RNA sequence: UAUUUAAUUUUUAUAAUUAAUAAGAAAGAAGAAUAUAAUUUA
RNA sequence: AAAAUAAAGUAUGAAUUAAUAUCAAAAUUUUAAUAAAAAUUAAAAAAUUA
């Protein structure tokens, strides 16, 4: 159900192993346990196995079988061939979101006649303002994203100092996103809206009308990459002008958001092709829209 | 190629010069400082007020890796001016927060400025240029001494306004998130440990 | 002041101190002229069958600081058109 | 259907003065612009005066926003913009016959002479257009993609 | 309700502030007498949440008088306690404000508060008064002497003249205070206040009159000095 | 003790005076309107002690004034 | 057309040309008050200039427009002028047939 | 009053003190020496007992109850600590939060899962609380002088902790008595 | 009870009761063949 | 919640994006496909 | 009130931020450049100068 | 009113290493108030 | 549940009540009848409002 299949550590060993079990001598992997060099430390009633027909033969079958039918065993290749780092691991990787603004409300129709109520969010400037890893520990990494370029004198003097240190243009607002080390983008990166795919789900954190709220499921409807808008099939209870922290909803009940069936994200971030210039581009042809719900 | 608009004139002084944008503009707009250490030190002494101190520091902590040894020396010398061997090292306190029963003290933007400088130095002299500290003992002793002048290993006296009521602001966290910002900062950690491990070769071979 | 939170109050900075003492190892393996990222051996048996006879898999990931250091330094390559110009089906 | 009385501008000319002083000076401006592009009289048609806005906050890039002297492509490494050059705009339209090339040529000419006219502030139409009749600013608009 | 007189008093931003009163009726009555009085003499010193309300209403009256229409007049006449003031509005304000569209009234927060209660006092004037016909050179920095006397005039401006029909009204309303039954009203009011007692109200034997003939004959003197 | 009188706090940052910087005052004035009265170019949120101008604060799209040293009578 | 800030874009002309046929009966001689952003005050000041007609407002010299919007004081005048400039010709075309 | 109503609190940002770095009239760092206590194959509550004796300062002849003068015990290899017989399973640790649902009954094994060292802290707390309860400072101040490490690796090599030579005289295994 | 970074793998944390909250022990409670039983002969 | 990200609002900056313009734009795309 | 309160009970209120704020606090002020009177910024004089230029 | 809970202590650039089930210069209107951070304004 | 009215406020200034220590939070058992009594374990900061 909502539990995985239970497995105890006392049960993982040679006889329970799905593929051949491997013993580690540290320079070399063999299918025999390591025979201690000092023979007088051998225990009574313990066999030291240099060769075993039973286990060696089964292994022999397995390997030759893997090579002669590579089309059947292409899954088995996962055992022997691990994916390198970066490269968007489907299970491992988490990217950062971006900071939006609830702008207005709208109404849309799908393919059929239906009245949708859309809330439009605006992502005026999203940069990566800060990198923070806490004492170098694992899984502690944060990318801080800022929004809304802002005049020199806006903030209390102590915030302005922060932006001066960073090197980023001064922002009205920041939010941190916990991420995996592969999802890092260099400080000062301009973030686009197509960082989100039009068919995905998105976790939204904003201020209610008066504490902080989180909507974890909400799908994306439509995206303007000219006016840097984004649309949601929802009515928030929130003030117009409210900043909203966007994220990817990472899983829905045993299902990853990102997979070959569904699709793949623009992994560390969306980056634009150098040839395009939004300055030559109109509002309408700039639209990206979802498949039918 | 050509201007999309006219450019109204300025005389030599009021130009914005002294900085440069990162190699790739349309993607990364980060601003790097080109200023020489001479005039950053200059700005630091000659405009004594907090924000220009912070600005000077924030610049010379961007630029650390790109400068030679004696440049670093006159930097640290310039910076260490306002510190008493007697006094609490890094404390610059502005607001008293009387909100809860006993008074709470908030430092100003100078504190994260100095710490940011120490951390910049940590990335420079340990991570990407590990040789440089062994090369010249002059700047070794300089860094060590500036590091002893601000007292980095008792951050607790950065947050203390009265020696009778010593603050634990640096040493104490709660799970409800009190002191999340002022919580444990590795500050001199890599730097001190590393420059200990420079002296830690006890082997008779070398 | 319950028992647990006083315990963690005292011991959290000591945990930090101890893992710092773990860190200084690489530092003395740095200053001596060697530079190496301490390597973790790849674990071949992650695939199992439990007593109820069903498939259980162990997810083991290994972060590479040399990859990360480059990922925080410079931009990604250009986003492929296969991604953004077509939606993600539901 | 074809696109109606929308007219592609040549230049847009700014002034630091508000809209009320400039109405008096509108008749003398056309006379000067005419020998700026060195065309005969009646060749240039000035659009309606547009006061921009009094910005306390100063949102940049807005259709009504006070234009500033500095520009990104002009000074790349400047950490900020030079202050506000123009509080008020008026457009420059030529004859309709000119196709898209000619108008842009007359545009680049105007910026060409006007820049030097502003730097001359360190008889000919340029500084007459600058000194006794204030215009501190000029720009070439972006062609709308909206068609 | 977007119509530029009829008012909505809430605390939400769409609406102008509801200053404390008994019933929205009572509120409307108050608004009406503040407007009336402000049209009569150009400034109104007003406490509380009333002041912003009073400014906005003022701006609305000027906007109406600018419209210069029969339905506009008659709508203003519904609203005012004084018919004559409608006329003074539509005569004056159009010449006055012809060159400005927005914000015709100037609100000013005073550094003194009612001692009666902590409420703050605001000073609400119509803006530029140099185009005003009958308010031209007046100076409100301090009040006049007796409150039925025509207000002060700036020294450089002494010899100005005003619309005949306005000073007619003003003198008519003034002349009932030079009468004796007003003096009786004055003494008796002292007595009444003392009975309810408000402290620092002198005994009616000590109350000597607001108006005498000597003070008058010098007042008229300097009044024709200003003319 | 020396008398307890506070020195001039007028030029430090204040949260209630900071509200009035970007507020629209056209109705508070008559002859004398100035572009933005409460907003001091280059200085944080109106306060003169907190001056940021001609340091490196990176503000691509907004204007910044140059630095002239303030007088003594404008601070205290 | 209505709430447009600053310049009047061509995408916005499109809005006008589109809403031309939304209203079936219109002659180039139609009264001013059918226009975008034409208020009571805007209309009145136009009338004392002897202008009753969409043709007449599309005939304005644009230096009439400005002093109409500055010395006189009808705001958003350039919007109604531009709206007229746009619409006048298709009206003549739908007028012939 | 003598003691103040406004107090140092756990929520209050100033924070709770560390009595090691603290300077107070009743705290003495001068005469302290460091010990190294190997708990490998030793019974948990007995280790905790001895450690508590050194921590507290009860093992010095000049021990005065008011004065807090400890010695620092570095307790190493907690992971190897022995709990006799069935006891790892059968010996409960209880506590009550003040709220509805105020009972936690937890097997020693579970505390051990979460932290091995929190166990040692538990029985230490007990052995100190035996004589020092009625005042907070005397409960809390001693405990910080125990440094618990669940294996042989500890930062304190510079103190040169002297091996603490101790053999428990007690023959029987420990027993659990809680009323 | 999941805070901090949460990996997209559908339920890793489920069996210890849904939290990431301790994780810093190198030592645990073991039947034969579980972790610190590394050093005992069986 | 009194934090900064949640309290501060972008209202003042809305003039930077043309809400009216885009609404009319998608009304054009509303009639183009015939809804 | 179920009981008489002692002097400490009475004094506990003055530790509060509310009590301090309401009662014991100092006002910022300067001298009106026109009136030479003490003044808090944001409040003004009924005078023809103070109303125009509000200093 | 004592306890007990719930809220608040008036922008905290940022939040979660654990408990239990979090806090930078200050008070008028938070609005110069008729939802534009000035609609041109004397 | 919309509408009207009433709650920070300046000033005035009562009444019930009052054995108390700067207070008395949580749980478990016992004690001659709730037991704010004992004993044990424990973990209650200040202010303001409902
Ligand atoms: Zn004054």
mmCIF file with all atom_site columns, N, CA, C and O in Angstrom, chain D residues 1 3-7 19 23 26 46 48-51 63-64 67 144 146-147, chain G residues 5-7 9-11 13-14 17 62-63 66 69-71 81 85-86 89-90 93:
data_model
loop_
_atom_site.group_PDB
_atom_site.id
_atom_site.type_symbol
_atom_site.label_atom_id
_atom_site.label_alt_id
_atom_site.label_comp_id
_atom_site.label_asym_id
_atom_site.label_entity_id
_atom_site.label_seq_id
_atom_site.pdbx_PDB_ins_code
_atom_site.Cartn_x
_atom_site.Cartn_y
_atom_site.Cartn_z
_atom_site.occupancy
_atom_site.B_iso_or_equiv
_atom_site.pdbx_formal_charge
_atom_site.auth_seq_id
_atom_site.auth_comp_id
_atom_site.auth_asym_id
_atom_site.auth_atom_id
_atom_site.pdbx_PDB_model_num
ATOM 1   N N  . UNK D 1 1   ? -7.167  41.131 -42.924 1.00 0.00 ? 1   UNK D N  1
ATOM 2   C CA . UNK D 1 1   ? -7.372  42.562 -43.123 1.00 0.00 ? 1   UNK D CA 1
ATOM 3   C C  . UNK D 1 1   ? -6.066  43.343 -42.923 1.00 0.00 ? 1   UNK D C  1
ATOM 4   O O  . UNK D 1 1   ? -5.263  42.994 -42.055 1.00 0.00 ? 1   UNK D O  1
ATOM 5   N N  . UNK D 1 3   ? -3.423  46.536 -41.958 1.00 0.00 ? 3   UNK D N  1
ATOM 6   C CA . UNK D 1 3   ? -3.294  47.337 -40.740 1.00 0.00 ? 3   UNK D CA 1
ATOM 7   C C  . UNK D 1 3   ? -3.386  48.841 -41.014 1.00 0.00 ? 3   UNK D C  1
ATOM 8   O O  . UNK D 1 3   ? -2.652  49.399 -41.841 1.00 0.00 ? 3   UNK D O  1
ATOM 9   N N  . UNK D 1 4   ? -4.315  49.471 -40.302 1.00 0.00 ? 4   UNK D N  1
ATOM 10  C CA . UNK D 1 4   ? -4.704  50.864 -40.494 1.00 0.00 ? 4   UNK D CA 1
ATOM 11  C C  . UNK D 1 4   ? -3.837  51.834 -39.702 1.00 0.00 ? 4   UNK D C  1
ATOM 12  O O  . UNK D 1 4   ? -2.708  51.498 -39.344 1.00 0.00 ? 4   UNK D O  1
ATOM 13  N N  . UNK D 1 5   ? -4.356  53.026 -39.419 1.00 0.00 ? 5   UNK D N  1
ATOM 14  C CA . UNK D 1 5   ? -3.559  54.240 -39.353 1.00 0.00 ? 5   UNK D CA 1
ATOM 15  C C  . UNK D 1 5   ? -2.415  54.308 -38.357 1.00 0.00 ? 5   UNK D C  1
ATOM 16  O O  . UNK D 1 5   ? -1.888  55.389 -38.089 1.00 0.00 ? 5   UNK D O  1
ATOM 17  N N  . UNK D 1 6   ? -2.040  53.158 -37.798 1.00 0.00 ? 6   UNK D N  1
ATOM 18  C CA . UNK D 1 6   ? -0.757  53.010 -37.112 1.00 0.00 ? 6   UNK D CA 1
ATOM 19  C C  . UNK D 1 6   ? 0.411   53.484 -37.983 1.00 0.00 ? 6   UNK D C  1
ATOM 20  O O  . UNK D 1 6   ? 0.544   53.075 -39.135 1.00 0.00 ? 6   UNK D O  1
ATOM 21  N N  . UNK D 1 7   ? 1.252   54.347 -37.423 1.00 0.00 ? 7   UNK D N  1
ATOM 22  C CA . UNK D 1 7   ? 2.406   54.872 -38.144 1.00 0.00 ? 7   UNK D CA 1
ATOM 23  C C  . UNK D 1 7   ? 3.701   54.555 -37.420 1.00 0.00 ? 7   UNK D C  1
ATOM 24  O O  . UNK D 1 7   ? 3.856   54.873 -36.242 1.00 0.00 ? 7   UNK D O  1
ATOM 25  N N  . UNK D 1 19  ? 5.145   69.215 -20.049 1.00 0.00 ? 19  UNK D N  1
ATOM 26  C CA . UNK D 1 19  ? 4.449   69.328 -21.330 1.00 0.00 ? 19  UNK D CA 1
ATOM 27  C C  . UNK D 1 19  ? 3.968   70.739 -21.641 1.00 0.00 ? 19  UNK D C  1
ATOM 28  O O  . UNK D 1 19  ? 3.716   71.067 -22.800 1.00 0.00 ? 19  UNK D O  1
ATOM 29  N N  . UNK D 1 23  ? 4.559   73.122 -25.640 1.00 0.00 ? 23  UNK D N  1
ATOM 30  C CA . UNK D 1 23  ? 3.505   73.362 -26.630 1.00 0.00 ? 23  UNK D CA 1
ATOM 31  C C  . UNK D 1 23  ? 3.768   74.653 -27.413 1.00 0.00 ? 23  UNK D C  1
ATOM 32  O O  . UNK D 1 23  ? 3.578   74.708 -28.630 1.00 0.00 ? 23  UNK D O  1
ATOM 33  N N  . UNK D 1 26  ? 6.554   73.972 -30.002 1.00 0.00 ? 26  UNK D N  1
ATOM 34  C CA . UNK D 1 26  ? 6.345   72.900 -30.973 1.00 0.00 ? 26  UNK D CA 1
ATOM 35  C C  . UNK D 1 26  ? 6.524   73.353 -32.428 1.00 0.00 ? 26  UNK D C  1
ATOM 36  O O  . UNK D 1 26  ? 7.003   72.588 -33.268 1.00 0.00 ? 26  UNK D O  1
ATOM 37  N N  . UNK D 1 46  ? 5.105   65.928 -36.117 1.00 0.00 ? 46  UNK D N  1
ATOM 38  C CA . UNK D 1 46  ? 5.276   65.618 -34.705 1.00 0.00 ? 46  UNK D CA 1
ATOM 39  C C  . UNK D 1 46  ? 3.971   65.105 -34.108 1.00 0.00 ? 46  UNK D C  1
ATOM 40  O O  . UNK D 1 46  ? 2.932   65.759 -34.209 1.00 0.00 ? 46  UNK D O  1
ATOM 41  N N  . UNK D 1 48  ? 1.424   63.746 -30.902 1.00 0.00 ? 48  UNK D N  1
ATOM 42  C CA . UNK D 1 48  ? 0.951   64.422 -29.686 1.00 0.00 ? 48  UNK D CA 1
ATOM 43  C C  . UNK D 1 48  ? 1.975   64.379 -28.551 1.00 0.00 ? 48  UNK D C  1
ATOM 44  O O  . UNK D 1 48  ? 2.664   63.371 -28.386 1.00 0.00 ? 48  UNK D O  1
ATOM 45  N N  . UNK D 1 49  ? 2.077   65.471 -27.795 1.00 0.00 ? 49  UNK D N  1
ATOM 46  C CA . UNK D 1 49  ? 2.966   65.536 -26.636 1.00 0.00 ? 49  UNK D CA 1
ATOM 47  C C  . UNK D 1 49  ? 2.582   64.492 -25.608 1.00 0.00 ? 49  UNK D C  1
ATOM 48  O O  . UNK D 1 49  ? 1.398   64.291 -25.333 1.00 0.00 ? 49  UNK D O  1
ATOM 49  N N  . UNK D 1 50  ? 3.573   63.816 -25.040 1.00 0.00 ? 50  UNK D N  1
ATOM 50  C CA . UNK D 1 50  ? 3.269   62.901 -23.956 1.00 0.00 ? 50  UNK D CA 1
ATOM 51  C C  . UNK D 1 50  ? 4.131   63.165 -22.729 1.00 0.00 ? 50  UNK D C  1
ATOM 52  O O  . UNK D 1 50  ? 5.334   62.913 -22.725 1.00 0.00 ? 50  UNK D O  1
ATOM 53  N N  . UNK D 1 51  ? 3.482   63.669 -21.687 1.00 0.00 ? 51  UNK D N  1
ATOM 54  C CA . UNK D 1 51  ? 4.072   63.784 -20.366 1.00 0.00 ? 51  UNK D CA 1
ATOM 55  C C  . UNK D 1 51  ? 4.232   62.357 -19.880 1.00 0.00 ? 51  UNK D C  1
ATOM 56  O O  . UNK D 1 51  ? 3.367   61.527 -20.167 1.00 0.00 ? 51  UNK D O  1
ATOM 57  N N  . UNK D 1 63  ? 5.926   51.705 -20.407 1.00 0.00 ? 63  UNK D N  1
ATOM 58  C CA . UNK D 1 63  ? 5.530   52.634 -21.469 1.00 0.00 ? 63  UNK D CA 1
ATOM 59  C C  . UNK D 1 63  ? 5.492   54.091 -21.034 1.00 0.00 ? 63  UNK D C  1
ATOM 60  O O  . UNK D 1 63  ? 5.915   54.941 -21.820 1.00 0.00 ? 63  UNK D O  1
ATOM 61  N N  . UNK D 1 64  ? 4.980   54.385 -19.842 1.00 0.00 ? 64  UNK D N  1
ATOM 62  C CA . UNK D 1 64  ? 5.246   55.686 -19.256 1.00 0.00 ? 64  UNK D CA 1
ATOM 63  C C  . UNK D 1 64  ? 6.270   55.491 -18.165 1.00 0.00 ? 64  UNK D C  1
ATOM 64  O O  . UNK D 1 64  ? 5.938   55.052 -17.058 1.00 0.00 ? 64  UNK D O  1
ATOM 65  N N  . UNK D 1 67  ? 12.662  58.510 -19.151 1.00 0.00 ? 67  UNK D N  1
ATOM 66  C CA . UNK D 1 67  ? 13.818  57.876 -19.774 1.00 0.00 ? 67  UNK D CA 1
ATOM 67  C C  . UNK D 1 67  ? 15.098  58.378 -19.130 1.00 0.00 ? 67  UNK D C  1
ATOM 68  O O  . UNK D 1 67  ? 15.177  59.538 -18.728 1.00 0.00 ? 67  UNK D O  1
ATOM 69  N N  . UNK D 1 144 ? 7.154   47.047 -33.257 1.00 0.00 ? 144 UNK D N  1
ATOM 70  C CA . UNK D 1 144 ? 6.211   46.163 -32.582 1.00 0.00 ? 144 UNK D CA 1
ATOM 71  C C  . UNK D 1 144 ? 6.016   44.856 -33.357 1.00 0.00 ? 144 UNK D C  1
ATOM 72  O O  . UNK D 1 144 ? 5.830   44.845 -34.577 1.00 0.00 ? 144 UNK D O  1
ATOM 73  N N  . UNK D 1 146 ? 3.614   43.003 -32.840 1.00 0.00 ? 146 UNK D N  1
ATOM 74  C CA . UNK D 1 146 ? 2.237   42.748 -32.466 1.00 0.00 ? 146 UNK D CA 1
ATOM 75  C C  . UNK D 1 146 ? 1.326   42.534 -33.677 1.00 0.00 ? 146 UNK D C  1
ATOM 76  O O  . UNK D 1 146 ? 0.132   42.245 -33.535 1.00 0.00 ? 146 UNK D O  1
ATOM 77  N N  . UNK D 1 147 ? 1.916   42.656 -34.864 1.00 0.00 ? 147 UNK D N  1
ATOM 78  C CA . UNK D 1 147 ? 1.239   42.397 -36.133 1.00 0.00 ? 147 UNK D CA 1
ATOM 79  C C  . UNK D 1 147 ? 1.491   40.963 -36.618 1.00 0.00 ? 147 UNK D C  1
ATOM 80  O O  . UNK D 1 147 ? 2.560   40.389 -36.386 1.00 0.00 ? 147 UNK D O  1
ATOM 81  N N  . UNK G 2 5   ? -1.787  51.526 -21.063 1.00 0.00 ? 5   UNK G N  1
ATOM 82  C CA . UNK G 2 5   ? -0.843  52.519 -20.580 1.00 0.00 ? 5   UNK G CA 1
ATOM 83  C C  . UNK G 2 5   ? 0.023   53.030 -21.720 1.00 0.00 ? 5   UNK G C  1
ATOM 84  O O  . UNK G 2 5   ? 0.353   52.270 -22.630 1.00 0.00 ? 5   UNK G O  1
ATOM 85  N N  . UNK G 2 6   ? 0.388   54.310 -21.674 1.00 0.00 ? 6   UNK G N  1
ATOM 86  C CA . UNK G 2 6   ? 1.316   54.896 -22.635 1.00 0.00 ? 6   UNK G CA 1
ATOM 87  C C  . UNK G 2 6   ? 0.953   54.816 -24.111 1.00 0.00 ? 6   UNK G C  1
ATOM 88  O O  . UNK G 2 6   ? -0.125  55.241 -24.518 1.00 0.00 ? 6   UNK G O  1
ATOM 89  N N  . UNK G 2 7   ? 1.863   54.264 -24.913 1.00 0.00 ? 7   UNK G N  1
ATOM 90  C CA . UNK G 2 7   ? 1.649   54.131 -26.353 1.00 0.00 ? 7   UNK G CA 1
ATOM 91  C C  . UNK G 2 7   ? 0.453   53.243 -26.658 1.00 0.00 ? 7   UNK G C  1
ATOM 92  O O  . UNK G 2 7   ? 0.050   52.414 -25.844 1.00 0.00 ? 7   UNK G O  1
ATOM 93  N N  . UNK G 2 9   ? -0.462  50.315 -28.912 1.00 0.00 ? 9   UNK G N  1
ATOM 94  C CA . UNK G 2 9   ? 0.160   49.263 -29.730 1.00 0.00 ? 9   UNK G CA 1
ATOM 95  C C  . UNK G 2 9   ? -0.741  48.754 -30.847 1.00 0.00 ? 9   UNK G C  1
ATOM 96  O O  . UNK G 2 9   ? -1.946  48.983 -30.838 1.00 0.00 ? 9   UNK G O  1
ATOM 97  N N  . UNK G 2 10  ? -0.146  48.074 -31.821 1.00 0.00 ? 10  UNK G N  1
ATOM 98  C CA . UNK G 2 10  ? -0.903  47.632 -32.982 1.00 0.00 ? 10  UNK G CA 1
ATOM 99  C C  . UNK G 2 10  ? -1.820  46.458 -32.671 1.00 0.00 ? 10  UNK G C  1
ATOM 100 O O  . UNK G 2 10  ? -2.926  46.361 -33.213 1.00 0.00 ? 10  UNK G O  1
ATOM 101 N N  . UNK G 2 11  ? -1.370  45.585 -31.777 1.00 0.00 ? 11  UNK G N  1
ATOM 102 C CA . UNK G 2 11  ? -2.215  44.528 -31.217 1.00 0.00 ? 11  UNK G CA 1
ATOM 103 C C  . UNK G 2 11  ? -3.487  45.120 -30.641 1.00 0.00 ? 11  UNK G C  1
ATOM 104 O O  . UNK G 2 11  ? -4.541  44.490 -30.641 1.00 0.00 ? 11  UNK G O  1
ATOM 105 N N  . UNK G 2 13  ? -4.828  48.170 -31.779 1.00 0.00 ? 13  UNK G N  1
ATOM 106 C CA . UNK G 2 13  ? -5.625  48.546 -32.944 1.00 0.00 ? 13  UNK G CA 1
ATOM 107 C C  . UNK G 2 13  ? -6.487  47.370 -33.349 1.00 0.00 ? 13  UNK G C  1
ATOM 108 O O  . UNK G 2 13  ? -7.666  47.531 -33.647 1.00 0.00 ? 13  UNK G O  1
ATOM 109 N N  . UNK G 2 14  ? -5.875  46.187 -33.374 1.00 0.00 ? 14  UNK G N  1
ATOM 110 C CA . UNK G 2 14  ? -6.578  44.950 -33.702 1.00 0.00 ? 14  UNK G CA 1
ATOM 111 C C  . UNK G 2 14  ? -7.850  44.767 -32.875 1.00 0.00 ? 14  UNK G C  1
ATOM 112 O O  . UNK G 2 14  ? -8.869  44.324 -33.395 1.00 0.00 ? 14  UNK G O  1
ATOM 113 N N  . UNK G 2 17  ? -10.418 47.293 -34.420 1.00 0.00 ? 17  UNK G N  1
ATOM 114 C CA . UNK G 2 17  ? -10.877 46.792 -35.708 1.00 0.00 ? 17  UNK G CA 1
ATOM 115 C C  . UNK G 2 17  ? -11.780 45.573 -35.541 1.00 0.00 ? 17  UNK G C  1
ATOM 116 O O  . UNK G 2 17  ? -12.737 45.391 -36.290 1.00 0.00 ? 17  UNK G O  1
ATOM 117 N N  . UNK G 2 62  ? -3.339  66.870 -34.246 1.00 0.00 ? 62  UNK G N  1
ATOM 118 C CA . UNK G 2 62  ? -2.514  66.280 -33.184 1.00 0.00 ? 62  UNK G CA 1
ATOM 119 C C  . UNK G 2 62  ? -1.818  67.331 -32.321 1.00 0.00 ? 62  UNK G C  1
ATOM 120 O O  . UNK G 2 62  ? -1.373  67.028 -31.218 1.00 0.00 ? 62  UNK G O  1
ATOM 121 N N  . UNK G 2 63  ? -1.720  68.561 -32.811 1.00 0.00 ? 63  UNK G N  1
ATOM 122 C CA . UNK G 2 63  ? -1.274  69.653 -31.963 1.00 0.00 ? 63  UNK G CA 1
ATOM 123 C C  . UNK G 2 63  ? -2.516  70.373 -31.471 1.00 0.00 ? 63  UNK G C  1
ATOM 124 O O  . UNK G 2 63  ? -2.451  71.323 -30.690 1.00 0.00 ? 63  UNK G O  1
ATOM 125 N N  . UNK G 2 66  ? -2.997  67.731 -28.250 1.00 0.00 ? 66  UNK G N  1
ATOM 126 C CA . UNK G 2 66  ? -2.173  67.920 -27.064 1.00 0.00 ? 66  UNK G CA 1
ATOM 127 C C  . UNK G 2 66  ? -2.672  69.070 -26.197 1.00 0.00 ? 66  UNK G C  1
ATOM 128 O O  . UNK G 2 66  ? -2.783  68.943 -24.979 1.00 0.00 ? 66  UNK G O  1
ATOM 129 N N  . UNK G 2 69  ? -5.451  68.159 -24.448 1.00 0.00 ? 69  UNK G N  1
ATOM 130 C CA . UNK G 2 69  ? -5.170  67.328 -23.280 1.00 0.00 ? 69  UNK G CA 1
ATOM 131 C C  . UNK G 2 69  ? -4.277  67.998 -22.229 1.00 0.00 ? 69  UNK G C  1
ATOM 132 O O  . UNK G 2 69  ? -4.043  67.419 -21.164 1.00 0.00 ? 69  UNK G O  1
ATOM 133 N N  . UNK G 2 70  ? -3.802  69.210 -22.501 1.00 0.00 ? 70  UNK G N  1
ATOM 134 C CA . UNK G 2 70  ? -2.893  69.877 -21.567 1.00 0.00 ? 70  UNK G CA 1
ATOM 135 C C  . UNK G 2 70  ? -3.384  71.264 -21.133 1.00 0.00 ? 70  UNK G C  1
ATOM 136 O O  . UNK G 2 70  ? -3.649  71.477 -19.951 1.00 0.00 ? 70  UNK G O  1
ATOM 137 N N  . UNK G 2 71  ? -3.509  72.202 -22.064 1.00 0.00 ? 71  UNK G N  1
ATOM 138 C CA . UNK G 2 71  ? -4.022  73.526 -21.719 1.00 0.00 ? 71  UNK G CA 1
ATOM 139 C C  . UNK G 2 71  ? -5.512  73.494 -21.351 1.00 0.00 ? 71  UNK G C  1
ATOM 140 O O  . UNK G 2 71  ? -5.965  74.226 -20.473 1.00 0.00 ? 71  UNK G O  1
ATOM 141 N N  . UNK G 2 81  ? -8.383  59.913 -29.953 1.00 0.00 ? 81  UNK G N  1
ATOM 142 C CA . UNK G 2 81  ? -7.890  60.402 -31.226 1.00 0.00 ? 81  UNK G CA 1
ATOM 143 C C  . UNK G 2 81  ? -7.331  59.247 -32.008 1.00 0.00 ? 81  UNK G C  1
ATOM 144 O O  . UNK G 2 81  ? -7.631  59.078 -33.186 1.00 0.00 ? 81  UNK G O  1
ATOM 145 N N  . UNK G 2 85  ? -8.526  57.623 -35.532 1.00 0.00 ? 85  UNK G N  1
ATOM 146 C CA . UNK G 2 85  ? -7.559  57.481 -36.617 1.00 0.00 ? 85  UNK G CA 1
ATOM 147 C C  . UNK G 2 85  ? -7.576  56.075 -37.184 1.00 0.00 ? 85  UNK G C  1
ATOM 148 O O  . UNK G 2 85  ? -7.449  55.872 -38.389 1.00 0.00 ? 85  UNK G O  1
ATOM 149 N N  . UNK G 2 86  ? -7.711  55.106 -36.288 1.00 0.00 ? 86  UNK G N  1
ATOM 150 C CA . UNK G 2 86  ? -7.782  53.701 -36.665 1.00 0.00 ? 86  UNK G CA 1
ATOM 151 C C  . UNK G 2 86  ? -9.037  53.372 -37.455 1.00 0.00 ? 86  UNK G C  1
ATOM 152 O O  . UNK G 2 86  ? -8.981  52.845 -38.569 1.00 0.00 ? 86  UNK G O  1
ATOM 153 N N  . UNK G 2 89  ? -11.497 54.784 -41.563 1.00 0.00 ? 89  UNK G N  1
ATOM 154 C CA . UNK G 2 89  ? -11.510 54.261 -42.938 1.00 0.00 ? 89  UNK G CA 1
ATOM 155 C C  . UNK G 2 89  ? -12.380 52.995 -43.160 1.00 0.00 ? 89  UNK G C  1
ATOM 156 O O  . UNK G 2 89  ? -13.158 52.942 -44.133 1.00 0.00 ? 89  UNK G O  1
ATOM 157 N N  . UNK G 2 90  ? -12.271 51.978 -42.278 1.00 0.00 ? 90  UNK G N  1
ATOM 158 C CA . UNK G 2 90  ? -13.177 50.829 -42.422 1.00 0.00 ? 90  UNK G CA 1
ATOM 159 C C  . UNK G 2 90  ? -14.652 51.211 -42.350 1.00 0.00 ? 90  UNK G C  1
ATOM 160 O O  . UNK G 2 90  ? -15.503 50.501 -42.895 1.00 0.00 ? 90  UNK G O  1
ATOM 161 N N  . UNK G 2 93  ? -15.540 52.273 -45.815 1.00 0.00 ? 93  UNK G N  1
ATOM 162 C CA . UNK G 2 93  ? -15.647 51.061 -46.626 1.00 0.00 ? 93  UNK G CA 1
ATOM 163 C C  . UNK G 2 93  ? -16.943 50.277 -46.385 1.00 0.00 ? 93  UNK G C  1
ATOM 164 O O  . UNK G 2 93  ? -17.553 49.776 -47.330 1.00 0.00 ? 93  UNK G O  1
#
